[PDB]
Write a structure and sequence with these properties.
2 copies of one chain form a homodimer.
Chain A lengths: L2 H6 L9 H11 L8 E2 H8 L3 H13 L3 E3 L3 E4 L2 H10 L3 H17 L2 E8 L2 E8 L7 E3 L4 H8 L3 H10 L13 H14 L2 E4 L6 E9 L5 E10 L5 H24 L1
Antiparallel strand pairs in A: 1-3, 2-3, 4-5, 4-9, 5-6, 7-8, 8-9
Bound molecules: chloride ion (3 copies).
């Protein structure tokens, strides 16, 4: 369950660097921790013993990833360059941006691209009018139902009964049966509109990003407010634009 | 150093080896670029794969999107980066040009926050987490101006001073005199020394101690704003935002 339990699950593998896993887990311990963190606080978050956590922080400090006053610790901007290593080496992310920017300019709305990681979607590219590297739940987002629809029937049920299908609004689908029917309908449309299931006033439309082999690599969407655009404009104007841009992107990376 | 975790340093350096390599990498390439022995690289990659940070097909390796969340841990736990976004956004919304915030990382500046305005640097596509040389960017001249004279001269005697354009200052003497004027000015304009058509003005961000933490800038196209307007109009807005961000963070 905990980050430590994940690390110690490989303790029988001789090629698994426990201290590198712990160090990466220490970086993750700062997620959404607006203030700075002590050793004890990080050791409670991750269940990593304080001695290891201190040595991880000490190591990150000497490498320029972190700083301290002796009591609290905070990450340094150099950590951002780690995410850049993924961006500047991933052609999908690089080639999506001009499409994301043009979509945003035509419609005056935010446009995004996410992949699936576990039970969440991970925003890998944005074009704003909440952040690259940020996560949202898959079951109640447009881009997530796209990527849940790409799953085979086996992996989808394993997700549904294992995910926290918490109800966020009056309209959020929160049970596996309702969601599976929803996914079956996304599967048949090849697009997805979610209306105010993540938070009120928010309504978005997503389409899949394919490779030349047919696999869904990712999803593309547009984020709108319910008061400005209607479901009619979403499906009759936004959808053809998103599909045109998605096929252009597919053809550009993979012929 | 007994508290230094070598495999953690190597793993992070393995990640960094993928910068600007849009092609899957071998053990051999990563070892050559980082000087890390091949066996240690192998184990580092194996650990990254098991943790979901990287993937392989048996021969080559590439990073997975989960690496992006590492940077998100910095952005969502640092007041400097959280509080600067509203300032950057209202600046770009007032002047209709891009606004940015950067710090000094080694010899480069590091972009840690951007406004929503699209500014397509043709020479290098710029994202959050990307770097630019300090000697020829507005924000870089600010953060170099914060160096003492000794550290500055050490930088100038080793840095790569490529003449990006015909206007780029690319010799240590000119940069030195240019930095010294940035010191006394409190701001810096770079006119098309990084790329043609690009011109920016930058100011420093201080802490309560008076130390330069970062720089704010406005990135403009030369066909949208005259040099007078960068300094008559864009400049005072940058100081006000900087001093407000400083007060909001340190009082
Ligand atoms: Cl090692
Ligand atoms: Cl030129
Ligand atoms: Cl001019």
């Amino acid at each position: 369950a905990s980050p430590a339990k994940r690390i110690q699950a490989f303790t029988g593998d001789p090629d698994f660097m426990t201290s590198l896993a712990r160090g990466l887990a220490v970086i993750q311990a700062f997620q959404e921790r607006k203030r700075h963190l002590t050793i004890a606080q990080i050791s409670h978050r991750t269940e990593i013993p304080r001695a290891a956590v201190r040595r991880c922080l000490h190591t990150l400090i000497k490498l320029g990833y972190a700083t301290t006053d002796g009591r609290t610790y905070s990450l340094l901007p150099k950590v951002l360059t780690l995410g850049h290593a993924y961006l500047s080496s991933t052609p999908l992310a690089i080639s999506a941006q001009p499409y994301l920017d043009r979509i945003s300019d035509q419609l005056h709305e935010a446009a995004n691209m996410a992949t699936l990681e576990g039970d969440d979607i991970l925003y890998i590219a944005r074009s704003a009018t909440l952040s690259v590297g940020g996560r949202l739940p898959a079951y109640c987002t447009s881009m997530g139902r796209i990527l849940l629809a790409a799953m085979d029937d086996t992996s989808l049920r394993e997700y549904l009964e294992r995910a926290d299908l918490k109800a966020r609004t009056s309209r959020t689908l929160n049970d596996p049966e309702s969601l599976f029917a929803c996914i079956q309908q996304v599967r048949a449309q090849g697009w997805c509109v979610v209306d105010q299931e993540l938070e009120q006033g928010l309504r978005s439309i997503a389409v899949p990003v394919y490779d030349a082999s047919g696999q869904v690599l990712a999803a593309l969407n547009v984020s709108t407010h319910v008061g400005r655009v209607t479901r009619s404009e979403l499906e009759q104007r936004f959808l053809p634009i998103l599909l045109a841009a998605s096929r252009d992107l597919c053809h550009q990376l993979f012929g």
